[PDB]
Scaffold this active site. Structure first.
Site, short mmCIF file in Angstrom:
data_model
loop_
_atom_site.label_atom_id
_atom_site.label_comp_id
_atom_site.label_asym_id
_atom_site.label_seq_id
_atom_site.Cartn_x
_atom_site.Cartn_y
_atom_site.Cartn_z
N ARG B 34 0.83 -1.20 0.00
CA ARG B 34 0.00 0.00 0.00
C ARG B 34 0.87 1.26 0.00
O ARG B 34 1.93 1.28 0.64
CB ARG B 34 -0.94 -0.01 1.21
CG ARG B 34 -1.63 -1.39 1.40
CD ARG B 34 -2.54 -1.50 2.64
NE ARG B 34 -1.81 -1.46 3.89
CZ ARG B 34 -1.81 -0.42 4.72
NH1 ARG B 34 -2.52 0.67 4.41
NH2 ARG B 34 -1.11 -0.46 5.86
N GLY B 84 -6.35 -6.90 14.08
CA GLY B 84 -7.44 -6.77 15.01
C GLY B 84 -7.15 -5.96 16.26
O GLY B 84 -7.87 -6.12 17.25
N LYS B 137 -15.74 -9.31 13.14
CA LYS B 137 -15.47 -10.47 12.29
C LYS B 137 -16.77 -11.13 11.81
O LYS B 137 -16.80 -11.68 10.71
CB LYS B 137 -14.57 -11.47 13.03
CG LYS B 137 -13.18 -10.90 13.35
CD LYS B 137 -12.16 -11.99 13.70
CE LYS B 137 -10.87 -11.41 14.31
NZ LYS B 137 -9.86 -12.48 14.57
#
Ligand code: NDP
Ligand code: NDP
Lengths: 310, 310
Positions: B34, B84, B137
């Site tokens: 990225r 996460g 999730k």
């Protein structure tokens, strides 16, 4: 008859490369694992990887003076790769606690402080705040001299990832895509070295009698290049010519006092290197230059370095 | 005829291990680089190391929807290793843009979203704020299913570095020296897995027909252990018995509301695993368990894992 070496800063950017180069070189390699990084998973696993290659873990903390004294009593040579990035919080000066520990311990045959850049005593008139890095390294050098600790100062080359991989463009760590800025006319000689070579040279020099109490320069002749020569290397590798914009010194330093302080320091350092040529504005003898001292190191040229970005 | 795999989150903790396992498995491995990452040297150099192993860089940004479309068009299987940790900033939900891109692209044989932990549909009763992770999730699972994207959900094991290497002590990533806290009575079975094994299982399952549209469990039998058994493995390696203090459930959770939010979530997750035994309170078939499915993987046992800490 292996030299025993302690690396302090073992998970640093140059520090981790020095650890691996000391192992490859055959030194009995000790690394300082500080309790304060016990929740930084990448540092903890680096240390686990060093162990798998034979490094010996030494626990100690810069807040525990006796822990530093115990650490340095295990080895012949200490190499510090302390960070230079937070100059306002004086992290270079943290090394003073290590110098004190080395003095008290008495046994260290040689100490390499965290240099690995521009030659501090030559930077007396550097732009502030970038000047602050050199003061602090000078204050550490003076602490070394006063204690009578034998030393080697490794200096003289730009880290390749930070100044060659990006064609000196500063804003990223990759070559630019279509346009490139040329600083000045781009005809000022700069010294570039693959950091793994800087690490190899450091491991070769730290028990070399020729460099006891000396400054060793890292100035591989094939890697003394102007910025435009660096850019042309890349243009030959890609086959595409980059649109060039020359940036005069005054426009480079324009409004510097409005930048954040770290960027101000980085701009100042860049100016001394790429506009004033501080890494090449003086000559050094083959007896104090690493590529001649250690000719078996087949240092990576900047055309082989840049290929990995294709 | 190689499986073409794109990894999103390629420099992540488990993600980079996934990249390497995919290469070693022989997949044609693409990694999303990225542009936002361009000044983080450790990520930039990871991508360079991936290239040298044969990975193919694919540039893309989550804020450029069609870059994601283009990236996912190149491959048969997509693996997300999205973080996460920043659940208050919803970074797990950032995967929803990747799911849209896969839906538009239409070519993706199978998507593995960022699971690799507790089985989210089994966590409907989790303590907040810790439950926010499983909620997010689940929302990702919805979008996958609502868009008809074929999937594999990889779940069921504790990352060894975060829960085995520290004897589950939380405050450090290294074994404790003389004292250890035992959570509850230390008789609750937990599943531990070396994360390189987790990545190997991920790489071997992503084109396995048996696990198409299935939840696959990482529950290697020799690695199902109570915390007390884990501790006794360490004591056998070191020959030093640790002094043990048991911590009752109510005292473990005391004053949770006064702790920082991320720590609150960390505690809640720990409670479900170690007090409630959430990883082992149900039976799973050998046809949905990775170490049975892939018996060629000689997974690391926790006695071998802990050896590297000696
Ligand atoms: N182009 C060039 O020539 C360049 C030269 N340099 C110079 O190289 C040397 C090292 O820089 P670099 O590798 O980038 O440094 P890093 O930013 O990578 O930090 C290296 C080590 O510094 C230690 N450290 C940081 N803060 C503390 C602290 N408060 N207390 C104790 N230890 C601390 C840590 O050791 P630990 O591993 O124990 O956690 C860390 O790993 C510097 O002198 C720098 O000026 C740097 C970049 C470019
Ligand atoms: N014991 C267990 O079972 C554990 C399971 N997990 C789970 O593993 C999975 C991955 O976690 P982990 O490896 O620790 O994650 P990391 O903290 O290493 O982050 C992984 C990647 O997430 C990407 N990322 C983070 N934020 C953004 C953002 N705003 N936008 C775009 N990309 C972002 C980055 O990808 P890039 O490389 O492109 O920069 C980063 O490298 C999670 O589902 C986690 O819950 C986590 C640890 C313990």
């Amino acid at each position: 008859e292996k030299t025993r070496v302690l690396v302090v800063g073992a998970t640093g950017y140059i520090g981790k490369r020095i650890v691996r180069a000391c192992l490859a070189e055959g030194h009995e390699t000790y690394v300082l694992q500080r309790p304060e990084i016990g929740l930084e998973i990448e540092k903890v696993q680096l240390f686990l990887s060093f162990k798998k290659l034979g490094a010996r873990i030494v626990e100690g903390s810069f807040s525990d003076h006796q822990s530093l004294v115990s650490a340095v009593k295990l080895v012949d040579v200490v190499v510090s790769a302390m960070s230079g990035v937070h100059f306002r919080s004086h992290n270079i000066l943290v090394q003073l606690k290590l110098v004190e520990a080395i003095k008290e311990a008495g046994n260290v045959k040689r100490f390499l402080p965290s240099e690995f850049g521009m030659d501090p005593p030559r930077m007396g008139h550097a732009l502030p705040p970038g000047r602050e890095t050199f003061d602090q390294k000078m204050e550490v050098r003076q602490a070394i001299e006063a204690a009578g600790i034998p030393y080697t100062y490794v200096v003289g080359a730009c880290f390749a990832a930070y100044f060659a991989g990006n064609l000196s463009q500063m804003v990223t760590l990759l070559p630019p895509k279509e346009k490139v800025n040329i600083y000045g006319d781009g005809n000022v000689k700069v010294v570039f070295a693959d950091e793994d070579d800087i690490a190899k040279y450091t491991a070769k020099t730290l028990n070399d009698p020729r460099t006891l109490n000396k400054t060793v320069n890292i100035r591989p002749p094939d890697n003394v290049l102007t910025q435009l020569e660096l850019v042309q290397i890349w243009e030959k590798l890609t086959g595409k010519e980059l649109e060039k914009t020359n940036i005069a010194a005054q426009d480079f330093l324009a409004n510097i006092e409005q930048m954040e302080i770290p960027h101000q320091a980085g701009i100042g350092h860049f100016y001394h290197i790429f506009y004033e040529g501080c890494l090449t504005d003086h000559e050094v003898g083959e007896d104090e230059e690493a590529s001649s001292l250690y000719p078996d190191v087949k240092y990576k040229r900047m055309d082989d370095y840049l290929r990995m970005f294709l």
